[PDB]
Structure formats: C-alpha cells, structure tokens
C-alpha cells in the first residue's frame, strides 16, 4: 500500500495539474497541452517566484493585480488561485 500510494502520487502528478486541478487530457487535446499548461500557464514554481517578487517589490509600485494578490494574501484569502479553470477554458470560444 505504501508503494502504491507513492505510485498514485506520481500518477496524479502526471495526470492532473497541481493548482487548477483540471485533468491532463483537457490540455492534451492539443499537442503538448499538459506540458505547456504545467510549465508556463500554471507552473508551480511560478507562483513562488511571484510571491517573492511581491515581497521584494515596494507596495507603492504594486500594480492592480499585484495589490489585489498582496491584499488577499495578508487576509489569508486563497480565492485568487484558479479553481477548475484556466485562461484557455475562460476564453476557449474566443481563442478557438
């Protein structure tokens, strides 16, 4: 069971995105869809880099989005994270 749990963790990693949680197949409809989504669109380390960038940046120079994320971060509101949605899904009819 321990080995199978490790395999299931790896399997879920390879079949669903960490943040949005959308299945890999939905992106993989186009070639390299899941790779693109998990490397550029919804990269895990990108949120860490963005949080660090917000911490280093002065609050006076914050943009609207940056100030929004900063405010709800110090309010401990994680709704800014996508939940079962992405840019492709949001503008799918407009994009393609």
């Amino acid at each position: 069971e321990l080995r199978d749990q490790q395999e299931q963790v790896k399997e879920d990693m390879e079949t669903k995105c960490f943040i949005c949680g959308i299945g890999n197949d939905y992106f993989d409809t186009v070639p390299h869809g899941f790779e693109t989504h998990t490397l550029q669109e919804h990269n895990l380390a990108n949120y860490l880099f963005f949080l660090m960038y917000l911490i280093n940046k002065d609050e006076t120079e914050h943009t609207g989005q940056e100030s929004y994320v900063w405010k709800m971060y110090q309010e401990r509101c994680w709704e800014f994270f996508p939940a079962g949605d992405c840019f492709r899904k949001q503008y799918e009819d407009q994009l393609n």
Binding site: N43, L48, F50, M52, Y68, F81, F87
Partner: protein, 184 residues
C-alpha cells in the same frame, strides 16, 4: 512583457506577428526571466500576470536542498490533503522555501572508460578482420575455381561467415578483458 501580453490577448491579428517575428531575439533572451501565472481577477476572470524572475533566485531554486524540500512537500500534500487545506499548505511551503533560498544565498557566498574500451575493441578487432581480408586472395580463389565448383565455391563464404563469428568472439573476450582491466 508588453509584446507577450499583446500576443496572448490577441492571438489572431496578423499585424502583431510582424513585430513578433521581428523580435524573436529579445523575447528569446527574456524568456527565462519572464514569469507567467493565472489568477482569479477582481472581475471574476482568468488574468495572466507577468513579472521578473531573477537568475540568482532561479539558481537558489535549483539548489539541491530546495529540490528535496519540494519533493517532500509535493508527496505530503498529494498523499494527505484537503481542497481548502491544499492551497494553505502550498503557501506555507512557499514561505518556508523563500526563507530556505534566502539562507542558501547566504551560506553559498561568492562509464566513460567502459565506453572507450568497448570502442577500442570494436575499432581494432574489426580492423583485424579487415587486415586478414586485405590479403586479397580473390584472384587466387578464381584460379582455384577455373570452372564452376559448388563446394569450393560455398566453402569460401562459409569460412568468411565463420571468421565473422570468431571475430565477434574475439570482441566479446576483448570487452571482458577491458572490463576486468577497469575494475582491477
């Protein structure tokens, strides 16, 4: 960043292509540094946000202890995790990793032999086959077979293939000898 944002938000307008294929090089240089995310906007839509990722920070991320911590946290949240608690554990790990990378910058102040032996055996054992076929006895063999002889005729290539196999054996022995040389 402005060009990438325009390209993504307008993916069909052909006139912006001219600028894009005129400016591969700037975009290619800034590609590692540019950071891309998606968030729940104030208008309840997905918004792509672009920021600057410093190369020093990326190296701190690529340092081994941060990698190990990331692996451990990824295993933990996936094995046990709540939908509400997932996004909280992720941000706690983010703060811990930020502290870890800050500490890493402070602390860090500013087979082939086996391959080569096999290649040498492959070179100068088939070179041995070439040397012993370089005698060029085909004219003498045609003197021998002045009229057709099926037996004399087949024995030639039979010996040739037998010698090819014996050269394979010599190669296997040479690889064993080279491996023994490498180990001791």
């Amino acid at each position: 960043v402005l060009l990438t944002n325009l390209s993504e938000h307008m993916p069909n307008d052909t006139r912006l292509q001219t600028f894009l294929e005129l400016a591969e090089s700037v975009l290619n240089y800034f590609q590692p540094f540019l950071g891309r995310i998606e968030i729940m906007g104030s208008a309840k839509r997905i918004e792509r946000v672009y920021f600057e990722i410093s190369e020093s920070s990326r190296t701190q991320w690529e340092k081994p202890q941060v990698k190990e911590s990331k692996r451990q946290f990824i295993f933990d949240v996936v094995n046990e995790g709540g939908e509400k608690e997932k996004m909280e554990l992720f941000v706690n790990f983010c703060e811990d990793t930020i502290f870890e990378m800050q500490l890493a910058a402070q602390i860090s102040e500013s087979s082939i032999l086996t391959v080569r032996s096999a290649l040498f055996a492959l070179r100068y054992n088939i070179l041995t086959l070439m040397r012993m076929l370089s005698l060029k006895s085909l004219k003498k063999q045609m003197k021998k077979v002045k009229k057709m002889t099926v037996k004399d005729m087949v024995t030639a290539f039979f010996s040739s293939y037998w010698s090819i196999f014996m050269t394979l054996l010599h190669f296997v022995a040479s690889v064993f000898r080279g491996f023994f040389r490498i180990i001791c």
